[PDB]
C-alpha cells in the first residue's frame, strides 16, 4: 500500500538478471504512467504509457542524457486499463530490458546507456495506486 511518486532504490546499481516487479492499479481516468531508471540526472530507460495521444493509447520509451531525449520507441499494444490492476515486470538482460505486463511479453528496449551499474534508482509515478515494488536477482 505505497506512495506515488515512489523511488525504488536499486542499491547494487542494475546488472543483468535483475528482475523488477511492480503491482498496482490504474486510477479511473488515467492519463499517464512513468517508470524511470535513473542514472543521476539522466534517465537510462523511460517507460511511459500514454492514455490520450490524439485519442489513442501508446507506450513511449526513450533515454534522456544531459537533458536531451533520444529517438522515441513506441508500442501500441496497450495492456493497461483505467481502474484495473496490473503487474509489470522489467527484466534486465545484457543487451536490453524486456518488459512483461500481466505475464504477456510487451516490448524489449535495447540499452543505450550501457554503464548499467550506475543506474541506482527506479522512479514510479503517474495515475496509479501502487501495491508493491521490488527487485530480485534471478
Ligand atoms: O513535456 C512533456 O509534455 C512531457 O515530456 C515528455 C518526457 N517526460 C514525460 C514525463 C513524465 C513525468 C511524470 F511526472 C509522469 F508522471 C509521466 F507519466 C511522464 N517526464 N518526462 C518523456 O516522455 C519524453 C519521451 O521521449 O517525451 C516528452 S519530452 C520530448 C518532446 C519531444 C520529443 Cl520528440 C522528445 Cl524525443 C521528447
Ligand atoms: Mg502477448
From Swiss-Prot:
The modification Phosphoserine is found at residue 76. A motif (Nuclear export signal) lies at residues 114-129. GO terms for cellular component: cell surface; collagen-containing extracellular matrix; cornified envelope; cytoplasm; external side of plasma membrane; extracellular matrix; extracellular region; extracellular space. A beta-D-galactoside binds at residues 69-75. It comes from the Eukaryota. The highest levels are found in activated macrophages. It is found in: Cytoplasm; Nucleus; Secreted. Keywords: Acetylation, Cytoplasm, Differentiation, Disulfide bond, IgE-binding protein, Immunity, Innate immunity, Lectin, mRNA processing, mRNA splicing, Nucleus, Phosphoprotein, Repeat, Secreted, Spliceosome. The keyword tRNA-binding does not apply. Residues 6-136 form the Galectin domain. GO terms for biological process: cell differentiation; extracellular matrix organization; innate immune response; mRNA processing; negative regulation of endocytosis; negative regulation of immunological synapse formation; negative regulation of T cell activation via T cell receptor contact with antigen bound to MHC molecule on antigen presenting cell; negative regulation of T cell receptor signaling pathway. One of its GO terms (molecular function) is carbohydrate binding. Galactose-specific lectin which binds IgE. May mediate with the alpha-3, beta-1 integrin the stimulation by CSPG4 of endothelial cells migration. Together with DMBT1, required for terminal differentiation of columnar epithelial cells during early embryogenesis. In the nucleus: acts as a pre-mRNA splicing factor. Involved in acute inflammatory responses including neutrophil activation and adhesion, chemoattraction of monocytes macrophages, opsonization of apoptotic neutrophils, and activation of mast cells. Probably forms homo- or heterodimers. Interacts with DMBT1. Interacts with CD6 and ALCAM. Forms a complex with the ITGA3, ITGB1 and CSPG4. Interacts with LGALS3BP, LYPD3, ZFTRAF1 and UACA. Interacts with TRIM16; this interaction mediates autophagy of damage endomembranes. Interacts with and inhibits by binding NCR3/NKp30. This is Galectin-3. It comes from Mus musculus (Mouse). The chain holds residues 127 to 264 of 264 of the full protein.
Amino acid at each position: 500500500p505505497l506512495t506515488v511518486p515512489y523511488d525504488l532504490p536499486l542499491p547494487g546499481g542494475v546488472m543483468p538478471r535483475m528482475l523488477i516487479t511492480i503491482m498496482g492499479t490504474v486510477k479511473p481516468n488515467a492519463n499517464r504512467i512513468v517508470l524511470d531508471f535513473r542514472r543521476g540526472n539522466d534517465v537510462a530507460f523511460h517507460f511511459n504509457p500514454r492514455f490520450n495521444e490524439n485519442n489513442r493509447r501508446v507506450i513511449v520509451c526513450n533515454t534522456k542524457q544531459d537533458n536531451n531525449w533520444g529517438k522515441e520507441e513506441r508500442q501500441s499494444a496497450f495492456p493497461f486499463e483505467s481502474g484495473k490492476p496490473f503487474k509489470i515486470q522489467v527484466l534486465v538482460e545484457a543487451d536490453h530490458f524486456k518488459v512483461a505486463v500481466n505475464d504477456a511479453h510487451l516490448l524489449q528496449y535495447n540499452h543505450r546507456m550501457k554503464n548499467l551499474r550506475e543506474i541506482s534508482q527506479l522512479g514510479i509515478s503517474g495515475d496509479i495506486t501502487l501495491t508493491s515494488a521490488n527487485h530480485a536477482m534471478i
